[PDB]
Ligand binder design. Structure first.
Ligand SMILES: [Cl-]
Ligand SMILES: [Mg+2]
Ligand SMILES: [Mg+2]
Ligand SMILES: [Mg+2]
Length: 175
């Protein structure tokens, strides 16, 4: 239960600092479902961009380090575990991931991990990121774990909403 214990430690330290953090990616799907559905390669977090130093301080306090700087976030390691961290920026009434559908970082805790309520990115934000992935790697060539996590997110949001979101993504990035 290494990752669950680590998620709880990170969120405890963030709560103490009044620092909201959103679980993202595959763990966000499992958190919203309230069920662990597979083994996860890492823990994805969305953090307030202007408070990055506070997240880095949590990482250091837990004995980890920032490992890799990305174009739109950073990777950290704590022990044998990887954190894939991306910023969200204040947009008047909420934090938002750049270019994501509005509502990407809801204020209420909408998931549960091992009995703990947790903030997590919205289904629309979760699914939106798979759309970027489809432009990168053809979906027919996706690892089955991604195919399965995608279809689970789409079952949870519903086919109607997913079709409309996909169409909006195509219109956004049409050239
Ligand atoms: Cl950043
Ligand atoms: Mg991940
Ligand atoms: Mg990741
Ligand atoms: Mg919402």
């Amino acid at each position: 239960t290494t990752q669950v214990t680590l998620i709880h430690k990170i969120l405890a330290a963030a709560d103490e600092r009044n620092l909201p953090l959103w679980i993202g990616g595959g763990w966000a799907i499992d958190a919203r479902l309230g069920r662990v559905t597979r083994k996860h390669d890492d823990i994805d977090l969305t953090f307030p961009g202007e408070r990055r130093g506070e997240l880095e301080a949590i990482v250091e306090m837990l004995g980890g380090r920032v490992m890799e700087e990305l174009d739109y976030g950073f990777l950290a390691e704590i022990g044998d575990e990887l954190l894939d961290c991306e910023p969200a920026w204040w947009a008047d009434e909420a934090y938002e991931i750049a270019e994501a559908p509005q509502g990407s970082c809801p204020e209420a805790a909408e998931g549960v991990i091992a009995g703990r309520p947790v903030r997590c990115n919205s289904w629309e934000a979760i699914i939106w990121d798979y759309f970027y992935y489809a432009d990168e790697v053809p979906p027919v060539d996706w690892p089955t774990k991604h195919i399965e996590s995608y279809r689970l997110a789409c079952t949870s949001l519903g086919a109607e909403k997913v079709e409309v979101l996909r169409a909006a993504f195509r219109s956004r990035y049409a050239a």
